Ligand binder design. Structure first.
Ligand SMILES: Nc1ncnc2c1ncn2[C@H]1C[C@H](O)[C@@H](COP(=O)(O)OP(=O)(O)OP(=O)(O)O)O1
Ligand SMILES: Nc1ncnc2c1ncn2[C@H]1C[C@H](O)[C@@H](COP(=O)(O)OP(=O)(O)OP(=O)(O)O)O1
Ligand SMILES: Nc1ncnc2c1ncn2[C@H]1C[C@H](O)[C@@H](COP(=O)(O)OP(=O)(O)OP(=O)(O)O)O1
Ligand SMILES: Nc1ncnc2c1ncn2[C@H]1C[C@H](O)[C@@H](COP(=O)(O)OP(=O)(O)OP(=O)(O)O)O1
Ligand SMILES: Nc1ncnc2c1ncn2[C@H]1C[C@H](O)[C@@H](COP(=O)(O)OP(=O)(O)OP(=O)(O)O)O1
Ligand SMILES: Nc1ncnc2c1ncn2[C@H]1C[C@H](O)[C@@H](COP(=O)(O)OP(=O)(O)OP(=O)(O)O)O1
Ligand SMILES: [Mg+2]
Ligand SMILES: [Mg+2]
Lengths: 874, 860
């Protein structure tokens, strides 16, 4: 055994040097009277033995170890023996002599580090790294952001570079060490996006022949030069609609604001660049502000004032005040643009029309469309079939054809009404096990529940199943009319005059519905009668189901496939110093509704009955997003009366402006064809729809708040003169567009304040930017807090240092009681003419808890519910 | 209690685990990115350790300093092996300490009002607490206590701070034990005098006048609440108040005063209103309640108790002077061989244990497994199923020791009743056990003979026979059984059973070894009964029958107070013994008897048991090592003188009160004193099997002549364990050698290390007491054998229990037993664990004429 001295030399391993060292430390804390002590000597030689033994235990016949490796094991032996005073003075003294070595080494230091790395160009030529341009992009990137250190990033980058780096991976190196900093300061996310933009500018501009490279503020003059170059190459490759050349590109080139690139989060820019920016040969040649300008232009190709409206639409989009739906963003400004990709259908009870509906499913899904299918009219197991002289097997064998079409065309949701004789088989279609002939693992399902069924649940009544072919009028009836006609058929079956039927207990079927929702996630629960009694289009059709995402309530028939034309307001951009900017909200809603009305005319239609319904009724669906983040800005916890109040009044405000905007389009473009007879014609607004719903169903089964903070009487008058759209509002999921704009999803509570993305190199944690901002004000943002958040997967509950006001404000989806989410949705639904996609989160998971929850959802006048997220751990 | 942390700048905050967790976590994070997931869990363990250490150090709460916490955090990290984190914690902590160095008090009275701290009174109570003590520093106490105070500190917590400060200094200078006690007295005075209303507070000097005022108030208030016998009002309370000596409160050690305050001083609604000297006067008055000259005897008894020259037994201290006083709580019974008497005996156990009494049960007469029962036509299952009922009764009434003779056919099951594993129906985990060993059995061991087991129902006379009559009769039954004339029996080798007995004593601690024949042959009462067993603690040898439950009336002499100038003070010793024997004879008459068999035996035979304590300390004051012939001679001659004065005292009481009812026929009437009965035992057993020193130093012949004229007590002497009364008087337990010279008292008040005060005094006298010596003693757990600086004479003197050869203990015990008419509780200590060493140890105990042995404390 030998030891590597501090500097090179090798010497034999001598226990004495260890024994002397430890003895020095004992004699330092004690006096000299400890010099001759059997105790010290016995202790030291014991510590020296277990140290020397440790080196023997890990190695065979001799070896070599570092001098510091021995010092560490000496401290270990002293420490494990509980020698606190001797161990710490050993550490202190040892560190004092390390300081003298470190300092003396720095005094004798010589400086060589030079020159610089040579950046390799694409053509293969070497070039010295530009330090001036490197400082420019990182400074313009840290511009306007707090607690960001540009010099810190430049130093950490400069480390991981080698002679012969390419300018390609010099930017990625800047990005790599920029997102590693978002964990301790979220504002680096903006810095990370601004650095990545440098690659995009070089990529796009170099492709367009404008410039081989450029900085941010250099875009103040280059965005106008790049736009006409972009349109010319875009149309050349048939990636952009040639009609866009009819715009005044010089005027639009000046309207572009290059500073809005600074708004992007890293995730938002990645999203657009990966999937939305136009490209050729893998090269993205569409820059972000030109992307927003393309969408604006595509939405204005038929406006009288092309440029003025295009600028109005570009300003709304590029500022993140509002964001068009995913299909609009992707296809606006391109040939035959699919601007809407959400449809509702109803399937007729004949074989030709069944397979006509299968055919429509395939065509509508050819470009990623989502579908709701009303299958209630199709006759159930045991029904007679003339011509065949046999008996039907019901809807499920046809749903299997639907299921395999969805697989073949690359989602769809089937709806069935609760008295349908196939309902029991329907509830089990998504079980993991069992007969596969009775499963549709690639198709969604939803219950179309009449009020009467829930009434029978509340009252422990019975419930009769029928085949629709024996009761063909029930599906189209609703409200009192349905309940009278249904009880007539019920009495008929009890007197043997309607053979094909099944009597069950309503509570038993209800329990089966909730257990399948819990076990399989399906079928979802949607309510037929509020969707129909509150539909503004009752005079010209019937709502036969909702859509794939359960927020749309539009009529369907033989000649009408309803189309959802969607967009969402960004509530975050309408919160100022803690308050809702009522004034700015009206301006954004007015422009949003116009853009959505334009979508109807520009949209390219594949099936004629989808064009027919859109042109006849002109429904749109204006939603919201950033609700949870808007609560943060007001310091309102989602589980409070104050959040329920904000949800009520914010929807009432948007609703007023949205309805008012539709009146303005009616003055300019004329009311939609079927306006005459609609609820709007009768002066029955959504707030009035709630009142009549309570009258119809009865206060015994529904209770909803009816408060109002605005004056609707003047608007209730102007609406009767005409509006442009049969439906205005719908709150849909906003997965992509919330990520693009950097806000929370629609109305969802935060699912978790922390997530650990891991998809390239290492894993990068992302923490709720609002949570960290509040923890700074309290002075509670530090390394230990970060280590606690990871341990608790982002939950601020049960960490002592956070005060209770923040534990409540940053409660996660599974630690907010479900009643808050339902009551909030209930008050938003008072002002929405369609519905809202409502995910529910339930910890504890019991059939009892599901019962009280979905009874409450119905009792509070909700039209739809969506996914159930259930945990049985609590 | 409330754990309060004192900041670096005086302020006070509540104790919060989180502060420690955050600090330790920062150090973990300073070292390390993916393996950082285990930080939260390991840190929470380390925090829990630290919090548990302060809970264990301050179970009732208290104050603590930041730097004290910091040191416990470091120690916790260091013991866990977190070398990287620990060293980084140290470096950072020192860095901040470097940075820091460069860059009034009011009290909350019980009524909630505030007032500045009376510095003047604080100086006086500290100064008066240091009176007469060397190496005590009143200024240090004041400065160190002030560091632990703060603005708004509760009144009581000031005294607590004083007591805690003084208590930690006990390990540096033992006299601080007296300081700690005297400082504690201040809260006792305020608590008691405020309750009685004679004063709201008082200093020690003020008690010179206030004790006399507080005695009448105490008797009246106590009598009113039925906590004191109303007859104590008949005493001249003025004359007894003047007799109280306030300076005797300055004698208390901290442990002794704390013991009296927690468990003895009369209390009402949680308030002790009985002060120490009043406590001793109540006991004295309680023991003098039937005396002709009540005041003179009460003063006589008060002077004996309050001086610590002698201390009555715990039950006497508890209950003397109260209504229906249980002054004795130690009993012996014998269980007859019939079911009604078996359950009568169990009924007696419950009744006698109703107030913490201890019991010795003789179960030998109950017939063994296999015996015929004419109740039915079945077989007995032995004594153990009934011992199970005894066990459950001890548990339900919560202390009981069952005795079984060595030929009993259930003995092998009896030997295993305290094993930790096995069938619980063959175990009695809450009941003690002891062997009742005949001399013949040991003779068989010495000679490697056989041994036959019988059921007592076939040999019902053996248990009461002893000596040569037992041996003749036993060998008759032995031969009778060898050829079929005795159905139920079992032959074994005596050596094999003896090995099992010793193996069970070592592995389970039970059963103990006691010797039936020395107890009976030397009993003064052989003419009226038979000793059937010893008691719970193995020091008492008294007769029992169906009409007589024996009662132990006990007290012990403090030998420390009878050594002056390194020599035994026989004049003072004579005075102490005479008064002590009187007090014990009074206990018999005053004691309330709930069982008539107990009253009958006490009134007929009037046995008492005067013992000793402080023997080890008495050796220190003479510089006599326990392991030396000088210790044997002191053990011999000190008990000889005590026994002489005690026998003389009992003659004096017979002159005054009459001899006890069964005196005629006793060994006393035959002129057979304990020294004579020892010589008789030698002749009876045979010199081959016993050897005891028979030297005398006193002139016993005239006393032998006087004893035959009449004595007051059938038995006089017994060395009991003195755990509590030795702690009250601050002396070593009974005859035990020092167990350890250094240990950690882990009380509910906190923790403090105690160091042998005689050892510290001798080391100071030689200039060897310093911090290095302290750490040497802590390292070696009090042992001085491996400390080179300590001279050899002190190494011998301060050897501890496991370092004194067991032969020394047995010989000293053998010499004491020459003079004692009953027995002595004798613990033995064996460091070398082996059956061979156990064999020679307990053979020697029998061979040296010992009556009993007690616990075996062993190591391997
Ligand atoms: N022969 C050896 N074998 C093993 N460990 C050794 C040996 N010599 C030294 N060490 C270890 C034990 C101590 O922790 C430390 C010794 O410190 P020290 O005696 O000062 O030696 P060193 O390497 O620092 O040289 P120097 O004499 O200048 O101090 O290194
Ligand atoms: N006064 C002291 N207090 C505490 N520990 C000490 C003291 N003196 C020595 N030691 C311990 C810690 C050191 O590692 C070792 C002494 O070796 P020493 O050579 O003086 O230090 P070192 O090896 O760490 O540095 P260097 O040799 O470079 O001066 O023993
Ligand atoms: N061969 C078949 N296999 C399975 N289902 C069938 C078959 N033929 C008909 N059906 C089902 C599909 C429809 O739900 C229902 C009605 O079928 P359809 O072709 O429309 O007859 P129909 O409408 O001309 O006459 P009717 O409705 O009066 O019986 O029967
Ligand atoms: N209230 C408390 N309860 C328990 N331990 C505490 C408390 N305050 C501090 N500590 C202990 C835990 C660690 O050993 C150490 C941590 O020091 P620290 O948290 O910095 O307190 P501090 O007195 O130094 O105040 P600060 O550092 O905030 O000025 O002190
Ligand atoms: N960076 C660190 N490295 C190692 N240990 C640390 C570190 N930070 C804190 N600790 C440990 C030791 C510190 O005493 C404690 C945190 O207390 P801290 O307030 O930072 O210092 P301190 O309490 O010793 O002095 P002060 O509080 O007066 O600044 O936890
Ligand atoms: N039912 C029983 N179960 C167990 N042991 C019993 C039972 N009855 C008696 N014994 C035991 C208890 C004694 O040790 C022994 C003698 O008891 P017991 O029959 O009451 O005495 P005895 O004197 O009245 O009758 P015996 O004529 O048999 O001596 O038998
Ligand atoms: Mg060195
Ligand atoms: Mg600190």
């Amino acid at each position: 055994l030998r030891v590597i001295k501090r500097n090179g030399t090798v010497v034999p391993y001598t226990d004495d040097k260890i024994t002397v060292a430890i003895t020095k430390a004992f004699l330092a804390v004690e006096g000299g009277t400890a010099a001759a002590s059997s105790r010290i000597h016995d202790t030291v030689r014991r510590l020296t033995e277990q140290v020397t033994a440790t080196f023997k235990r890990r190695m065979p016949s001799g070896g070599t170890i570092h001098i510091e490796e021995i010092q560490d094991q000496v401290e270990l032996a002293l420490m494990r023996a509980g020698e606190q005073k001797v161990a710490r003075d050993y550490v202190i003294y040892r560190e004092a002599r390390a300081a003298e070595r470190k300092n003396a080494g720095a005094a004798s230091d010589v400086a060589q580090p030079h020159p610089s790395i040579r950046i390799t160009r694409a053509d293969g030529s070497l070039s010295p790294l530009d330090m001036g341009r490197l400082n420019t992009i990182i400074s313009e990137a840290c511009e306007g952001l707090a607690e960001v250190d540009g010099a810190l990033i430049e130093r950490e980058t400069l480390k991981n570079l080698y002679d012969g780096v390419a300018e390609k991976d010099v930017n990625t190196a800047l990005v790599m060490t920029a997102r590693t900093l978002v964990e301790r300061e979220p504002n680096y996310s903006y810095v990370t996006a601004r650095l990545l933009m440098d690659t995009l500018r070089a990529e796009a501009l170099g492709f367009l022949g404008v410039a081989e490279s450029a900085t941010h503020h250099e875009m103040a003059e280059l965005y106008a030069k790049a736009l006409p170059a972009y349109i010319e190459k875009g149309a050349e490759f048939e990636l952009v609609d040639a009609k866009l050349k009819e715009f005044d590109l010089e005027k639009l080139g000046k309207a572009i604001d290059h500073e809005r690139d600074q708004q992007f989060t890293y995730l938002g820019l990645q999203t657009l660049y990966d999937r939305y920016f136009i490209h050729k040969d893998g090269i993205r040649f569409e820059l972000p502000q030109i992307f927003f300008m393309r969408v604006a232009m595509g939405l204005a190709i038929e406006e009288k004032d092309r440029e003025a409206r295009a600028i109005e639409f570009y300003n709304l989009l590029s500022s993140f005040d509002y964001m068009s739906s995913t299909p609009t963003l992707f296809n606006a400004g391109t040939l035959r643009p699919q601007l809407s990709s959400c449809y509702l259908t109803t399937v007729p009870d004949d074989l030709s029309g069944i397979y006509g509906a299968i055919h429509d499913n395939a065509m509508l899904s050819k470009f990623a469309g989502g579908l709701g299918n009303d299958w209630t009219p199709v006759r159930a197991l045991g029904s007679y079939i003339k011509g065949t002289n046999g008996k039907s097997q019901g809807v499920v064998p046809f749903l299997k054809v639907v299921n395999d079409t969805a697989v073949a065309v690359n989602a769809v949701c089937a709806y069935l009404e609760t008295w349908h004789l196939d309902i029991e088989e329907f509830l089990e279609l998504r079980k993991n096990t069992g007969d596969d002939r009775r499963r549709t693992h690639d198709m969604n399902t939803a219950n179309w529940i009449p009020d009467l069924f829930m009434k029978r649940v509340f009252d422990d009544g019975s419930w009769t199943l029928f085949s629709p072919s024996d009761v063909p009028d029930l599906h189209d009836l609703y409200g009192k009319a349905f309940e009278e006609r249904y009880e007539y058929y019920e009495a008929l079956a009890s007197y043997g005059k309607l053979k094909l039927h099944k009597v069950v207990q309503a509570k038993d079927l209800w329990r089966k519905m909730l257990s399948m929702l819990f076990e399989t996630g399906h079928p979802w629960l949607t309510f037929k009668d509020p969707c129909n009694l509150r539909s503004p289009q009752q005079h010209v059709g019937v709502v036969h189901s909702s859509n794939l995402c359960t927020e749309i309530t539009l009529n369907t028939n033989k000649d009408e496939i309803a189309v959802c034309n969607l967009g969402s307001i960004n509530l975050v951009n309408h919160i100022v110093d803690g308050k809702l900017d009522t004034a700015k909200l009206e301006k954004t809603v007015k422009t949003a509704v116009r853009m959505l009305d334009n979508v109807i005319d520009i949209n390219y239609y594949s099936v004629p009955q989808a064009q027919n319904s859109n042109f006849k009724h002109r429904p749109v669906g204006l939603g919201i997003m950033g609700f949870q983040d808007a609560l943060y800005l007001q310091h309102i916890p989602y589980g409070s009366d104050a959040a329920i109040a904000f949800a009520d009044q914010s929807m009432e405000a948007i609703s007023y402006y949205a309805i008012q905007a539709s009146c303005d389009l009616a003055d300019e473009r004329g009311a939609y064809q079927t306006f005459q007879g609609s609820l709007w014609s009768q002066g029955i607004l959504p707030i009035d729809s709630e009142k009549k719903l309570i009258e119809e169903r009865g206060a015994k089964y529904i209770e909803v708040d009816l408060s109002e903070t605005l004056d609707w009487a003047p608007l209730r008058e102007r609406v009767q003169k005409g509006i442009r759209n049969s439906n205005i509002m719908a709150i849909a999921p906003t997965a992509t567009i919330a990520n693009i704009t950097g806000v929370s999803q629609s109305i969802e509570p935060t699912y978790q304040n922390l997530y650990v993305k891991s998809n390239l190199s290492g894993e990068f944690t992302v923490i709720n930017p609002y949570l960290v901002r509040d923890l700074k004000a309290r002075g509670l943002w530090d390394p230990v807090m970060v280590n606690d958040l990871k341990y608790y997967d982002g939950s601020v509950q049960q960490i002592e240092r956070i005060p209770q006001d923040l534990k409540d404000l940053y409660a996660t989806a599974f630690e907010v009681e479900t009643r808050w989410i339902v009551e909030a949705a209930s008050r938003r639904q008072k002002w929405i003419d369609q519905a809202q996609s409502l995910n529910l989160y339930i910890a504890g998971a019991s059939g009892k808890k599901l019962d009280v929850t979905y009874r409450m959802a119905w009792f509070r006048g909700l039209k739809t519910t969506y996914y159930l997220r259930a945990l049985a751990a609590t």
